[model samples]
Structures are given as structure tokens and as C-alpha cells.
Target: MIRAVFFDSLGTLNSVEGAAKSHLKIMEEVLGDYPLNPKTLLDEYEKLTREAFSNYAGKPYRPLRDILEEVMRKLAEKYGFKYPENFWEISLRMSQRYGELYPEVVEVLKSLKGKYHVGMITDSDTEQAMAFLDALGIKDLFDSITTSEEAGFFKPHPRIFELALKKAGVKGEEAVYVGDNPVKDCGGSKNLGMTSILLDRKGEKREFWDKCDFIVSDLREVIKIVDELN
Candidate 1:
């Protein structure tokens, strides 16, 4: 029997691009005084921010602030200019908007709460995720949460699943993990013998989807799946 469900934060319930855009706007403000067009600097800043993360995955994990600061520094250097003082603080200010949840996230989560114990497990900073939750108006729903920083392991690593199960007080077979990440979220949960579901909002094909217990387009669909299984 499925006693509980664990959800992924980014992409599953919210969009990271939406969350970080405001901070990018702030960066644009700082870069405005320079000779470069603000849009060009913002574009480079956003592009490099993600590229840097993907390049250094699972190595020495930098705090999100450090990652964004490096993006700012690189953008400044590319234009042959010195970075502004307190740039890190300015970039960090944008973190407050990092992962705004989707519109249906709260409704689905509310629907599931009475039927199954709910928890959240994702590879993210706790504060960033909290900011996302606060904006979504549903942070209080989860019984447990585990981010990559908190767990010391990246997703698709089975230990993170163990940590979540420990927190939710459930066994692998007794819990289900739901997420939008094809590899790290569902794949990792399944490797540990937990039920896993994929929220494929992108509508792309992946051989990995075959392994998930269900495929959904939105969090609201998750409610229907739970109802059917129950």
C-alpha cells in the first residue's frame, strides 16, 4: 500500500526560470551603467549561470549565490569591465524568486494530504525551496523535505530516497516519489524500489518513462492517479 508521496520542487510543482527572472532583472539594472546592452548582459548572465552548474555537477557544490556571482563576474569580464562591489548581494536578492510553484500545485497537494502523508525531496538549497513554497502559499503541507545540500548526495543517488523515507517514516515499497526530472527524480526513486511517477509536462519521449509507474502532465493529474490507486 502507498502510505505517502514525495514530490520534486522544481519543474514538477514550479518553474525555475520564473523564480529567477526578477533577480536577473536586478542584474540588468547593475549592468545598465556599462556600455553593453542590458538585455545582452542579462542573456549572458542567465546562459552562463546554468552552463556553470551543468559543467560542475556533483563536484564541489557551490552555494546558489556563488554560482550566480560567478555568472555576474563572467558577464563583467566578457565585456572588459570590473564587477560592481556587492554584486553577490545583488544576485542573492534574486534568489527570493527562484522557484515559483505552478498554479495547480496547491490544489493537488491539498487533495492528496488527507489520503496520503506528503513529503518533498529535491536537489536544491533549503532556503531557495522555502522561498518557492512561500510564494506558492503551500509550504506547510509537506511532512518532510530533503534537498541535495541537506542530503550530501545528488539525485539518481539512492541514498537521498533513503533519507526521505526515513523522514516520512515509510519503507521504499510503501512510498511513492513524484517528480518532473526523468533521470534524477523518478529514476532514482525506482532504483531504491519505491513507486515513482513522472510529470512530463514537456511532452517529450524518453526511454526512461517506461520505468515510471505513471506519467502525468500536471500536479492536478496526480490527484486522479492517487484516487484511482486508492
Candidate 2:
């Protein structure tokens, strides 16, 4: 049976409002007369991101803002374009109050409030995560908020989840982790004995078998999973 439900923050619980759009906007402006697919840029950055995270696997914690800056700089170096000025503030604002939670997020979380320990396990700074959750008005709903800054490790790393489970006072098998990323959110938690649920909002599929124990397109579905699991 499950006693805790943990969620990923950015993509799983809410849509980021500002910085990403700005990245595309500035990229288009910089690469004038030569158009490039946005995916080309993001895909390139994603590769760099994996490398970045891999380097930090057993190393000290690096603030995500610094890693993002490194990635953005790397992107500029690769494409020979001017990196957007003032990106940090845009991103900081995004972390603060510019998130748009999914239509069913609040209702779903509230539904599970009385029945289970609902918490958040995110790869974010404590301040950023706290501010974002506060902005969403759901900060009080979470029984625990585990962040990389506090854990000194990021998600997909067993240490962070271990810390979260410790904080929630439950074993891995007694928790359910719901998130969008197949590798980080789904596979990561599964490796530690938790039941992983993939929030496949994009209709994405993967070949890797460790993706998730269950696939859900909506947050409301979590209710039935928890009920049945218990």
C-alpha cells in the first residue's frame, strides 16, 4: 500500500510561462535570415544537459541556475549567436510567480489531501521551488518539499529520493512518484523500489522498459491508482 504521493515540479505539475518562450524568441531574432527548428536548439541543449547532470552524479550540488547558465552559454558558443541578455531575471521571475498549473492539478491534489501524504520532489533550489509553490497557492498542501539544494543531490539520484522518503517518513515501496520525464522521473524512482507513474501529457512513448509502472495522461487518474494500490 502507498502512503505518500510525490510529484515533479516544472513539467509535471505546471507549465513554465516565461523563460522558454524567451529563449525561442531571442534565438529567432539572433539567427535572422536563417531559420532553425526550435527542437534543433532544445535537443542540442538536452544533450548537453545530460552530460552536465552526469558530471554531477557523485559530485557536489550545483545550483540549477548556474547549470542553466552554463547550458545557455554552451548553446551560444555552438551556434555563434548572441545569448539573450537578462535571461536570469526572466528565469527567476518564472521560478517566482510565472507558472501555470494544469487545469486539474489543484482539484486532484486537493482530492488526495485527506487520504495520503502529498509531497513534491523536484530538481530545484529550495527558494525557487518554495516561491513557485507559494505562487500556485498549493504550498500548504504539500506535507514535504524536497529539493536538490537541500539534499545536495538531484533527482534520479537515489540520495535525493532517499532523503525525501526520510522526510515523508515512508519507505520507497510505500510511495508513488508521478512525473513526466521517462528517464529522470519514472525510471529514477522505480530503481529505488517506488511505484513510478508517468504523466505522459505529450503522448510520448519510449523504448526503455524502466519507464514507469503506470502511464497516466491526466492527474485525476492518480486518484484511482492510489485507491487501488492501497
Candidate 3:
């Protein structure tokens, strides 16, 4: 039986309000446009972000803010734009505001609250995650919050998952992980004996589908899976 339901932040729990489109627009308004394509910029942002977190995999904790800054700085340099000294703060504020909660998130969490131990495990910074939860007005709902910054390792790494499980007081098999990424979410959770549920909101059927124990297109489907397990 499942005792806890841990969710992945960013895509799974909340997303940047306008997603990449808005962020790009924000940059264009904040800093003049350059010879950059929207898709390329967003793709590179993900690439650089992965590299940033990968570098700190086995090392001490590092704030995601530092990684984001490096990403922005690299983009600025590539586009011949000068980043303002206060750009970081502005960017952070933009991110904080952009983390809009999904429509079904709060209601589903509320339904699952008394039934299961609900928590979050994100590769983001703890403070940023907490701030976003507070912004969503569901900060009081979660029983535990685990971030790579505090765990000192990213998802797909067993240590971080173990930390969350330990905090929830449940064994891996007694919990389920819901996330958007196939490798980090499905592959990671399954590797440690936990059930993995892939939140495929885009409706794409990828090869990674086999990695997840269940595939859900909506947050509410999670409730059915939990019910079946219990």
C-alpha cells in the first residue's frame, strides 16, 4: 500500500506562468532582442541547466540561483547583451511570479491530504520551491519538501529519494513518485523500488513509457492510481 505521494516540482507541480514563451518575452523586454530563436534559447537553457546541476552532483550544495545566473550570463554573452547588476533579482522575481499552479493541483492535493502523506521532491532550490508553494497558497499542505540543494544530489540519484522517503517514514515500495521527466522521474523512482507515475501532459507516447509503472495525462488520474494501490 502507498503511504506517501511525492511529486516533482517545475513541470509536475507548477510551471513558469507563460512557460518559455513568457520568459523569452521577458528577456526581450528587459534586454533587447538578438539573433536567437525561441526554441534554441529554451533548449539551450535546459541544456545549460542540466550541466550546471550535473557539476554539483557529488559535491556540496549549490543554490539553483547560481546555475540560473550562469545560464543568463551565457545567453547574454552569446547575444551581445550586457546583463544589468540587478538582473538576477529581476529574473528571480519573474520566476517566482511565473510558477503558476496547475488547475487541478490544489483540489487534488486537498483530496489526497488526509488520505496519504503528500510531499515534494524537486531538483530546484529549497527556498525557491517553498516560495513557489507559498505563492500557490498550498504551502501548508505538504508534509515534507526535498530539494537537490538540501539533499546535495539531483533526482535519479538514490540519495535524494532516500532522504524524502526517510522524512516521510515510508519505504520505497510504500510510496509513489509523480513527475514529468522520464529518466529523472520514472527511471529514478523505479530504480529504488518505488512505483513511478509519469505525468505526460503533452500526450506524447515516448519509449520511456515503459519506464513508468503508470502513465497519467492529468493530475486527477493520480487519485485513481493511489486508490488502486491502497
Candidate 4:
């Protein structure tokens, strides 16, 4: 029987492009509208972030705050904008808007809460993750949370998923995992024997669908998949 239901925070529920959203919004206030349009800025920030994280995968675990500042600094230098002196303060205050939750997240999480232990396992800083979750009003729904920093390991590493199982006090086979990352999220959880579901919101991951046990386009579909599994 499925004893717990685990979710990935970034692309599964929160906006994966969250940093870009904030990058565009905050930088506009700092630099004004002379340099470029919001879309262009968002795209550039996202590109840099992706490049940075992929490189950091097997290296040391730096706080997301450090990573965010580097990305912002690079953008500032690239476009001749003055990098702000107190970006860390602003980032923490504005971190609440870092990731907007998907439309169906609250409802789906609520439905799972009463039926099983609802947990969150993600590659994030605890404060950064909680900032958005608290702002979005879903922080109370998670019974347990395991972050990369807390575990000293990122997903695709067995240690992170193993730590989550320990937190929820469930055997891997007794939990179901949902995430947007084909490799780190579903692939990691599936390796631990949890039923893994991939959330491919835009059908952009058709090639990776088979890598997960199940695939769905919406968070709502996760509810039905979990019920049928139990």
C-alpha cells in the first residue's frame, strides 16, 4: 500500500522559470525600460541559470542565493547595468514571488493530504522553498520536506531520495513520487522503488515519458494516479 505521496517543488508545482520572472520584474525597476523588453531579459536570465546549475550538478552545494547573485551579476555586466549593492536583501524580501504555484497545486495537495502522508523533496534552499510555499499558502500541506542542502546531495544521487524516505518513515516501495525533472526527479525516485510520475505540462518531454512509470500533463492527474495505485 502507498503510505506517502511525495512531490517535487520546482517544475512540478512551482514555476521552474521562477527566477526569470523575478529577474525581469526586479531588474526593470533597477534599470528602467531603456535596455530591453521583459521577454528578452527573462530569456537571458533563464539561459544563464540553466547553464550554471547543469555545471554545478556534481560539484559543491552552494546556496541558491549565491547562484542567483552570480546570474544577476553576469546579466548586469553583460548589459552595462549597475549591479545593486544590496541584492541579497531584495532577493530575500522578493523571494516570496520567486515561484508562482501552478493552478491545480493546492487542490491536488489537499486531496492527497487526508489520504496519505504528503511530503516534499526538491533541490532547493529551505528558506527559498518555504518563502514561495508560505506566500502561496501551501506550506502547511507538507508533512515533511527534504532539500538538497539539508541532505547534502542533489537528486539523481541516491542519498537525497533515501533521506526523503527516512523523513516520511516509509519504505521506498510504499511511496509515490511526482516531479517535472525526468532524470533527477522521477528517475531518482523510481530508482528507489517509488512509483514515479512525470509532469510534462507542455508535452515537451515526449521522448522521456517512458523513463517514468506514468506521465501526465496536469497536477490533477496525479490524484487519480495515486488513488489507482493504492
- lDDT for residue 147 in candidate 3, whole number 0-100: 85
Candidate 3 lDDT at 79 equals 68
Deviation of model 4 at 34, angstroms: 5.4
Worst 10 residues of 3 by lDDT: 16-25
Lowest summed lDDT over 10 consecutive residues: which window, candidate 2?
16-25
lDDT of 4 by residue, 134-196 (tens): 876788999998888887766767777888899989999999899987877888898889999
* Model 2 misplaced stretches (Cα beyond 4 Å): 16-60, 77-86, 94-98
| Poorly placed runs, candidate 4 (over 4 Å) | 15-23, 58-60, 92-99
Cα lDDT tens digits for candidate 1, 1-230: 78888999866876646645655567675876667776677777768866765664444344665666777777777897678778755544554445356778777788778678898987777776676566666788887878767776667777778888888888988888898767677778987778788988766736668868888877777767766776
> lDDT, candidate 4, residue 26?
64
Clashes of 3: 1
Q: Which sections of candidate 3 miss by over 4 Å? A: 33-43, 50-61
Sort the candidates on lDDT, descending order.
4, 3, 2, 1
Candidate 2: residue 99 lDDT (0-100): 54
Per-residue lDDT over 1-230 for candidate 3, one digit per residue giving the tens place of the 0 to 100 score:
89999999878877535456446655654464555664666677778877876676545566777778878789878867675566555655665666567788988888889789998988888777877677667888898998887788777888788899999999999999999887887888877688899998876757788889999988899999999988
Provide the lDDT at 8 for model 4.
89
Error of 1 at 225 (Å): 2.0
Give residue 212's lDDT in candidate 1 (0 to 100). Answer: 82
Instruction: Estimate TM-scores for all models.
Output: 0.80, 0.80, 0.87, 0.89
Clash pairs, candidate 1, are: 19-97, 19-98
